[PDB]
Amino acid sequence: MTDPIADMLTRVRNANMVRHEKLELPASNIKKEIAEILKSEGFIKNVEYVEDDKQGVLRLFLKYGQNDERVITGLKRISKPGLRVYAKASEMPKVLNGLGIALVSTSEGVITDKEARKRNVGGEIIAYVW
Amino acid sequence: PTINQLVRKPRQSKIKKSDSPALNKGFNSKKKKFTDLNSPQKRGVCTRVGTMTPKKPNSALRKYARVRLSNNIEINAYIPGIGHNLQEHSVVLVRGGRVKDLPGVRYHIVRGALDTSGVDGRRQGRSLYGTKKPKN
RNA sequence: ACUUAUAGAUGGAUCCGCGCUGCAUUAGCUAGUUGGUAAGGUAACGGCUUACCAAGGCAACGAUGCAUAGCCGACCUGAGAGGGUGAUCGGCCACACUGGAACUGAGACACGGUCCAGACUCCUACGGGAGGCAGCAGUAGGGAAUCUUCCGCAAUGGGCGAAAGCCUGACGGAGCAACGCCGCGUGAGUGAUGAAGGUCUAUCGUAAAACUCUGUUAUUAGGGAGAACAUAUGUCACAUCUUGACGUACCUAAUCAGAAAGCCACGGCUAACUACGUGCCAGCAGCCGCGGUAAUACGUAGGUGGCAAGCGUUAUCCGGAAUUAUUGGGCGUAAAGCGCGCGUAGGCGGUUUUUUAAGUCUGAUGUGAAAGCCCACGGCUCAACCGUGGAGGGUCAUUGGAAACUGGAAAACUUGAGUGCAGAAGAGGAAAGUGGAAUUCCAUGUGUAGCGGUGAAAUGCGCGAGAUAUGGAGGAACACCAGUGGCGAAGGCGACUUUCUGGUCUGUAACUGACGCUGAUGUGCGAAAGCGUGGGGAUCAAACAGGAUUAGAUACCCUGGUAGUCCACGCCGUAAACGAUGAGUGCUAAGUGUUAGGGGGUGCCCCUUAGUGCUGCAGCUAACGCAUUAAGCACUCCGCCUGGGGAGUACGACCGCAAGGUUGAA
């Protein structure tokens, strides 16, 4: 339980393998950031925040689209305690030529892969969710 | 594939050994120990002629050469071609490595090469077992 | 034109820093290891010799030993990280016969110095000379090649000189090796298919001839390409009556015709064309690969694919080799997973706020040069030989504001826990053998012709064994509750009269408010045998005594037969530990067999807070298998693996009562 989000990350794609949703998951202050900034793009049925203390409970409720097909086709974290890879906000890579998105913490608040390119802010840029 | 113990403990490469280890070498007498050289060019001075019979894959007949290199060791050769140099005691230009189908021999002869010229029954080769001044 | 109070400077550097490789067949650490304390002194602090005393300073982290021992503009080169060799090219340093050397210097132990020890071809009335081309040559050479003793200051003056002048052996003048590759030149307007035809029997034949075109090789010629040198010339800006060995180049130059050796394999890939020779006689062959009577391979012969200063070979790292994995590494299976109870260092190392204000966000600045940089271009008969630098010289001369955090680090959360626990299971383990398979022994209640023996019999107990059991306690195992059940990490495992013993935890968690994960330090310990007491036979099993065999037996066969077979004490470890499954985080149908024992409960329906084995949705791996109770997807360590042998054989380092291990280039 040392990474409070770790498996939970790909549990999106390892829960919606056949587009399925029966998986309730635990919280963070970034499990108040992991599932809250891609609803910016209509990606979740509901994660509004975690409503408990002690980093509790949360319905994952992963929105699925109109072609029936994996909203999250595949997904990896490349940022875990035990894998610390820190880069700048300039050559943040091209996430499938920009087809994917990133949602991550920065060195000046909280941003996305829509901010690093136009704000020069960020630290351990995390993943490629698609 | 985990990187902690990777600077604690490293890995290897493959495992291969190069070609003709008792070749590319010139044996000392003053300081008695060999030279790791990989020289382009070299000589061959003769001790016998040599021939063994049992040949399966070809199943015709042809001999080879037993030429000793420097200062007391077994060094063995072969004459790949249709030319028989019924000779010995020569001073030549070495060819390094083995041609197909003879184990353990890695030492050969260039065409001409200061000892003889070659099997003079060739005129079309113009570039095989002795062939100089050939009309092209 | 002298000597000094003083200077800008020269190699350097007194020195600081990262520059500053490998050998684990080298950790119980050097006596100075820790550093303070000296008369001393080098342009230079000071264990640098000495000055005073205590080491555990070390400490399983490389102390130390220790093997090549230059680095750095260069070159082939990657897409990029740079990645290697750093030789023409070295700007910096180790180095001149030898050990030194009293010396010294505008700069020291000194490549033709200065002395005295050495073994060298040697010179000498043998005063005894001291010299060696890591400085051009050349000699005997070793030689894949491994060069001109052609000339002598003229391209820079060091030094000497108030000056006119030098030495160049610093730098220069070159046989040039077709070594680099280029500047281009050795045939033309060509030509009707054109012959006397060379693989084939129309092919390269638009072969040829005999006509013309270029200077560019060749008969000569004048050949002056660069460029500015100089007390008295008159008064460091500086200068004339002072700069042609190569000083001949650009050489248009009329210009005849002054050939550009010869190409490989000769099919198809590495790019190639067919065959007589050839009857397996010689023999083709870059991985693939060919001749035994049509080598679309070979001996040889006119050439199409590449070519004309070029033919086959020589062997070095590059992208290619994705056979390093910094970008681009397997786990059950190639060539690969823990004997595990154990487990130091630390790689990793809960939730939330966090005190941090370092760092990353990135950056004001410093903006200190580059010849050339991520570029391009200009001088040049274009190629050998030089240059504008806008790319700031790569946190370099200032430390930052974003606390979202690896970071001086205050706590709280608890249900994830451990002792409380009903206790409760199952062959988890320790329980004498009261009784019983009580055994081949035998007078025997009983007796002799059999207990018994077999692919093929002797084996084998009867010149007074027998059949099963009347005393039959005993060498011993629970034989029957015994199931695949289940304690425990794998090896296991069976009544108990029970001598003892933990955890495991099945339900939530009372206490404390992180109560930390793989675990090389240690310890280690783990199958009969191999191992430790003498018991050592209930006597079977090895050897085999021995028969017997189809053509073929000391034999799996056969009664019996000496370790062992009946063990409470030293330590272990090879096995298909074939379990060939290594352990943190959940997981997309749950049922299902169900487990002592249970969340709601009450021979009636059950869910994991649970456990196993699963048919198997679902989705991945690699052909396969896992699956609400996952090799699939996500954070993990000891790590191994990265085509095969041989290879654990030279040899080997350290444990050790023993099997022995456990190392290790070729």
Add this chain to the structure above:
RNA sequence: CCUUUUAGGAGCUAGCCGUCGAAGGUGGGACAAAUGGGGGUGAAGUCGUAACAAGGUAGCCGUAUCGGAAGGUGCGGCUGGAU
């Protein structure tokens, strides 16, 4: 430019007591290198009779013991044993 210039009481380089003494010189095994039986392999007169399926005494691994490979026994995980 020590100044009884000889010189000397001291006292400077040269004799005398010394002072460590690198190097060579010898001193020991490690080292050594051309050299002085194991194996590794050769290239076939030779050898056992099979392993692959209840294949011919079924097919294998460590090991009391094996052993010219093949070939056969007790005992540990065994089946990768067919009926």
Add this chain to the structure above:
RNA sequence: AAAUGACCCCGUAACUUCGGGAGAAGGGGUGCUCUUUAGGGUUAACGCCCAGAAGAGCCGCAGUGAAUAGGCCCAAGCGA
């Protein structure tokens, strides 16, 4: 037969039944005067008993100046 031999300080191999080998092998030091402080318990303190390093000097051909004190190394055979 000669040679080594006492005491004190350095240093010490292969092998092993871990006791050994081992005094392995190899080296070095000693006379006399003068200082310094290094001792003790026998003690009221050198009277009394010596023995411990560091320096200065003096002499000879020679300094446990006489007598008495292990010669080592390598490799085989046999029996603990």
